[PDB]
Amino acid sequence: KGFNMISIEQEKELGNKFAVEIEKQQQPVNDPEVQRYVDKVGKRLLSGARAVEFDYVFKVVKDDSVNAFAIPGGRVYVHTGLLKAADNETELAGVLAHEINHAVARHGTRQMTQEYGYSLVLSLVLGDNMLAQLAGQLFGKAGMMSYSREYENQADFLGVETMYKAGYNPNGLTSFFQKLNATHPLTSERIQRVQAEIAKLPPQRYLTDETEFKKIKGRLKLE
Ligand SMILES: [Zn+2]
């Protein structure tokens, strides 16, 4: 169960390599305004996180599927489809806060190390074509990085805290899920755990300025 973990510095390098490989199959958004907006919400959430140990980069990708995913080394990809599906900035932030916390807790590199072993992960770091196999399998359009129940719970727990500290209503993620119904599996357990975490916080009115969100969403539906 225990394993040798690569260093923060080594993971920065792993992320660099994954990023360039993953991006070969993506169509980027090259819209400074959309870029600026996602950067802002991401930066705001990071101010609420427990540890910011990477220079986080938020990349918006042209893809109608509803997804966001962190890769090793603090790089978070956000699909245009997610931005278009979100009803408000709070929903968007809820999804982003969960993914940021997978990065904060180093879940990607932990899961890869438990699955493949330290030697393989270290070899990715050093670049010993294996890196290309893994990019596709973990992070491509049919690719499932899949996190243990424990890591999902951690990302949920931290995401509620992150949202709260950043001044967003922590119900954002579950609200997004409800709207969607009207691989990060939203199980009975996760709903119960998230509701309990939210229940422990002081009741308060969450203030939002949806100006920028509505502008950006508007621009994306034009594409
Ligand atoms: Zn997750």
CSV table of C-alpha atoms and ligand atoms in Angstrom, one decimal:
chain,number,residue,atom,x,y,z
A,1,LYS,CA,0.0,0.0,0.0
A,2,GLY,CA,2.9,2.3,0.8
A,3,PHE,CA,5.2,3.5,-2.0
A,4,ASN,CA,8.1,5.7,-2.8
A,5,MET,CA,6.9,9.0,-4.1
A,6,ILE,CA,8.8,11.2,-6.6
A,7,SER,CA,9.6,14.7,-5.4
A,8,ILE,CA,7.6,17.9,-6.1
A,9,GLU,CA,10.4,19.0,-8.4
A,10,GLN,CA,10.3,15.7,-10.3
A,11,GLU,CA,6.6,15.9,-10.7
A,12,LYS,CA,6.9,19.4,-12.3
A,13,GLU,CA,9.0,17.7,-14.9
A,14,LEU,CA,6.5,14.8,-15.4
A,15,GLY,CA,3.7,17.3,-15.8
A,16,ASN,CA,5.7,19.3,-18.4
A,17,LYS,CA,6.1,16.1,-20.5
A,18,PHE,CA,2.5,15.0,-20.1
A,19,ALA,CA,1.3,18.4,-21.1
A,20,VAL,CA,3.1,18.6,-24.4
A,21,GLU,CA,1.9,15.1,-25.3
A,22,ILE,CA,-1.7,15.6,-24.3
A,23,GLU,CA,-1.9,18.9,-26.1
A,24,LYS,CA,-1.0,17.2,-29.4
A,25,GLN,CA,-4.6,15.7,-29.6
A,26,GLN,CA,-6.4,18.9,-28.3
A,27,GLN,CA,-7.6,22.0,-30.1
A,28,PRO,CA,-6.7,24.9,-27.9
A,29,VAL,CA,-8.8,27.9,-27.2
A,30,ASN,CA,-6.7,30.9,-28.3
A,31,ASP,CA,-9.1,33.5,-26.9
A,32,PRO,CA,-7.3,35.8,-24.4
A,33,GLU,CA,-10.6,36.8,-22.7
A,34,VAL,CA,-11.7,33.2,-22.1
A,35,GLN,CA,-8.1,32.4,-21.0
A,36,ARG,CA,-8.2,35.4,-18.6
A,37,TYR,CA,-11.4,34.4,-17.1
A,38,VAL,CA,-10.5,30.8,-16.4
A,39,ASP,CA,-7.1,32.0,-15.0
A,40,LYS,CA,-9.0,34.3,-12.6
A,41,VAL,CA,-11.4,31.7,-11.2
A,42,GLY,CA,-8.4,29.2,-10.9
A,43,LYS,CA,-6.2,31.8,-9.1
A,44,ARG,CA,-9.1,32.6,-6.7
A,45,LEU,CA,-9.6,28.9,-5.8
A,46,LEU,CA,-5.9,28.4,-5.3
A,47,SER,CA,-5.9,31.1,-2.7
A,48,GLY,CA,-8.2,28.8,-0.7
A,49,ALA,CA,-6.1,25.7,-1.2
A,50,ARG,CA,-3.9,24.1,1.5
A,51,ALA,CA,-0.7,24.0,-0.5
A,52,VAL,CA,0.2,25.6,-3.8
A,53,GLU,CA,3.4,23.7,-4.7
A,54,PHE,CA,3.4,24.2,-8.5
A,55,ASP,CA,3.0,27.1,-10.9
A,56,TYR,CA,-0.5,26.2,-11.7
A,57,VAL,CA,-1.6,26.6,-15.4
A,58,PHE,CA,-5.2,26.4,-16.5
A,59,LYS,CA,-5.7,25.4,-20.1
A,60,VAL,CA,-9.1,25.8,-21.9
A,61,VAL,CA,-9.5,23.2,-24.6
A,62,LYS,CA,-12.1,23.2,-27.5
A,63,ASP,CA,-14.1,20.1,-26.7
A,64,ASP,CA,-17.9,19.8,-26.3
A,65,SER,CA,-17.6,17.0,-23.7
A,66,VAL,CA,-18.2,18.1,-20.2
A,67,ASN,CA,-14.9,17.6,-18.4
A,68,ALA,CA,-12.0,19.1,-16.5
A,69,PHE,CA,-8.9,17.2,-15.4
A,70,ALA,CA,-5.7,17.9,-13.6
A,71,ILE,CA,-2.5,16.2,-14.7
A,72,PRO,CA,0.6,15.8,-12.6
A,73,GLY,CA,2.5,19.1,-11.8
A,74,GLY,CA,-0.4,21.5,-11.3
A,75,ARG,CA,-1.8,21.7,-14.9
A,76,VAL,CA,-5.6,21.7,-15.2
A,77,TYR,CA,-7.5,21.3,-18.4
A,78,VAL,CA,-10.9,22.8,-18.8
A,79,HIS,CA,-13.3,21.8,-21.7
A,80,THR,CA,-15.3,24.4,-23.4
A,81,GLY,CA,-18.2,21.9,-23.0
A,82,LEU,CA,-17.9,22.3,-19.2
A,83,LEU,CA,-18.0,26.1,-19.3
A,84,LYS,CA,-21.1,25.9,-21.6
A,85,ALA,CA,-22.9,23.4,-19.3
A,86,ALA,CA,-22.3,25.3,-16.1
A,87,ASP,CA,-25.3,27.6,-15.2
A,88,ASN,CA,-23.1,30.0,-13.1
A,89,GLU,CA,-19.6,30.6,-11.9
A,90,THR,CA,-20.2,28.8,-8.7
A,91,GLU,CA,-20.9,25.5,-10.5
A,92,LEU,CA,-17.8,26.0,-12.7
A,93,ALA,CA,-15.8,26.7,-9.6
A,94,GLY,CA,-17.1,23.6,-7.8
A,95,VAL,CA,-15.8,21.4,-10.6
A,96,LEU,CA,-12.5,23.3,-10.7
A,97,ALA,CA,-12.0,23.1,-6.9
A,98,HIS,CA,-12.4,19.3,-7.0
A,99,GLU,CA,-9.7,19.0,-9.8
A,100,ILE,CA,-7.4,21.5,-8.2
A,101,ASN,CA,-7.5,19.4,-5.0
A,102,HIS,CA,-6.6,16.3,-6.9
A,103,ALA,CA,-3.5,18.3,-7.9
A,104,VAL,CA,-2.9,19.6,-4.4
A,105,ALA,CA,-3.0,16.1,-2.9
A,106,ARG,CA,-0.8,14.7,-5.8
A,107,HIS,CA,-3.5,12.1,-6.6
A,108,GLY,CA,-2.4,11.5,-10.2
A,109,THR,CA,1.2,10.7,-9.3
A,110,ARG,CA,0.1,8.7,-6.3
A,111,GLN,CA,-2.4,6.6,-8.3
A,112,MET,CA,0.2,6.1,-11.1
A,113,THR,CA,2.8,5.0,-8.6
A,114,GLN,CA,0.5,2.5,-6.9
A,115,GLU,CA,-0.5,1.1,-10.3
A,116,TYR,CA,2.8,1.0,-12.2
A,117,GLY,CA,5.5,1.3,-9.5
A,118,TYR,CA,8.1,3.9,-8.7
A,119,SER,CA,10.6,2.8,-11.3
A,120,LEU,CA,8.2,3.3,-14.2
A,121,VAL,CA,7.1,6.7,-12.8
A,122,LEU,CA,10.7,7.8,-12.3
A,123,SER,CA,11.4,6.6,-15.9
A,124,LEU,CA,8.6,8.9,-17.2
A,125,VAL,CA,10.2,11.7,-15.2
A,126,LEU,CA,13.6,11.1,-16.8
A,127,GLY,CA,12.2,10.3,-20.3
A,128,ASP,CA,13.8,6.8,-20.5
A,129,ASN,CA,7.4,6.6,-25.9
A,130,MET,CA,6.0,5.1,-22.7
A,131,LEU,CA,5.1,8.7,-21.7
A,132,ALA,CA,3.0,8.8,-24.9
A,133,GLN,CA,1.2,5.5,-24.1
A,134,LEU,CA,0.2,6.8,-20.7
A,135,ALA,CA,-0.9,10.3,-21.8
A,136,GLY,CA,-3.5,8.7,-24.1
A,137,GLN,CA,-4.6,6.1,-21.7
A,138,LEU,CA,-5.0,8.3,-18.6
A,139,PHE,CA,-5.9,11.6,-20.2
A,140,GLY,CA,-7.3,11.1,-23.7
A,141,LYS,CA,-10.9,11.2,-25.0
A,142,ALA,CA,-11.6,7.6,-24.0
A,143,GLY,CA,-8.9,7.6,-21.3
A,144,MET,CA,-9.8,7.0,-17.7
A,145,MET,CA,-7.5,8.1,-15.0
A,146,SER,CA,-9.6,6.7,-12.2
A,147,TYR,CA,-9.2,7.6,-8.6
A,148,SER,CA,-9.7,5.4,-5.5
A,149,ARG,CA,-12.7,6.0,-3.3
A,150,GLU,CA,-10.3,7.5,-0.7
A,151,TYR,CA,-8.8,10.0,-3.1
A,152,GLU,CA,-12.3,11.1,-4.3
A,153,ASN,CA,-13.3,11.7,-0.7
A,154,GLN,CA,-10.2,13.7,-0.1
A,155,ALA,CA,-10.7,15.8,-3.2
A,156,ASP,CA,-14.4,16.3,-2.2
A,157,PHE,CA,-13.5,17.3,1.4
A,158,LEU,CA,-10.8,19.7,0.3
A,159,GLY,CA,-12.9,21.1,-2.5
A,160,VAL,CA,-15.7,22.1,0.0
A,161,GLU,CA,-13.0,23.9,2.1
A,162,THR,CA,-11.4,25.5,-0.9
A,163,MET,CA,-14.8,26.8,-2.1
A,164,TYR,CA,-15.7,28.1,1.3
A,165,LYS,CA,-12.3,29.9,1.8
A,166,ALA,CA,-12.6,31.4,-1.8
A,167,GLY,CA,-16.1,32.7,-0.9
A,168,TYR,CA,-18.0,30.4,-3.2
A,169,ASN,CA,-21.1,28.5,-2.1
A,170,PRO,CA,-19.6,25.0,-1.5
A,171,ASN,CA,-22.8,23.4,-2.9
A,172,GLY,CA,-21.5,24.3,-6.4
A,173,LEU,CA,-20.3,20.9,-7.4
A,174,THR,CA,-23.4,19.0,-6.3
A,175,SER,CA,-25.7,21.7,-7.9
A,176,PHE,CA,-23.8,21.2,-11.2
A,177,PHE,CA,-24.4,17.5,-11.0
A,178,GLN,CA,-28.1,18.0,-10.4
A,179,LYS,CA,-28.4,20.2,-13.4
A,180,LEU,CA,-26.5,17.7,-15.5
A,181,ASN,CA,-29.1,15.0,-14.4
A,182,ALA,CA,-31.9,17.5,-15.3
A,183,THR,CA,-14.7,9.3,-14.4
A,184,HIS,CA,-15.3,10.9,-11.0
A,185,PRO,CA,-18.3,8.7,-9.9
A,186,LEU,CA,-20.8,10.6,-7.8
A,187,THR,CA,-21.9,7.9,-5.4
A,188,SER,CA,-24.3,7.9,-2.5
A,189,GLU,CA,-21.3,8.1,-0.2
A,190,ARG,CA,-19.9,11.1,-1.9
A,191,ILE,CA,-23.2,13.0,-1.7
A,192,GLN,CA,-23.6,12.2,2.0
A,193,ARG,CA,-20.0,13.2,2.7
A,194,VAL,CA,-20.3,16.4,0.8
A,195,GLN,CA,-23.6,17.4,2.4
A,196,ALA,CA,-22.2,16.7,5.9
A,197,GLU,CA,-19.1,18.9,5.2
A,198,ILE,CA,-21.3,21.8,4.0
A,199,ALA,CA,-23.6,21.3,7.0
A,200,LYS,CA,-20.7,22.0,9.3
A,201,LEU,CA,-20.1,25.5,7.9
A,202,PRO,CA,-21.8,28.8,9.2
A,203,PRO,CA,-24.9,29.6,7.2
A,204,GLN,CA,-24.3,32.7,5.0
A,205,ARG,CA,-25.3,34.4,1.8
A,206,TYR,CA,-22.8,33.8,-1.0
A,207,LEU,CA,-22.4,36.9,-3.2
A,208,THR,CA,-21.6,36.4,-6.9
A,209,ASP,CA,-20.9,38.7,-9.8
A,210,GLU,CA,-22.0,36.7,-12.8
A,211,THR,CA,-21.0,39.5,-15.3
A,212,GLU,CA,-17.8,37.9,-16.5
A,213,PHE,CA,-19.2,34.3,-16.5
A,214,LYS,CA,-22.2,35.2,-18.6
A,215,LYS,CA,-20.0,37.1,-21.1
A,216,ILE,CA,-17.5,34.2,-21.5
A,217,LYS,CA,-20.3,31.6,-21.7
A,218,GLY,CA,-21.9,33.8,-24.4
A,219,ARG,CA,-18.7,33.9,-26.4
A,220,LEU,CA,-18.3,30.2,-26.2
A,221,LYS,CA,-21.8,29.3,-27.4
A,222,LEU,CA,-20.9,31.4,-30.5
A,223,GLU,CA,-18.3,28.8,-31.4
B,1,ZN,ZN,-12.3,13.3,-8.6
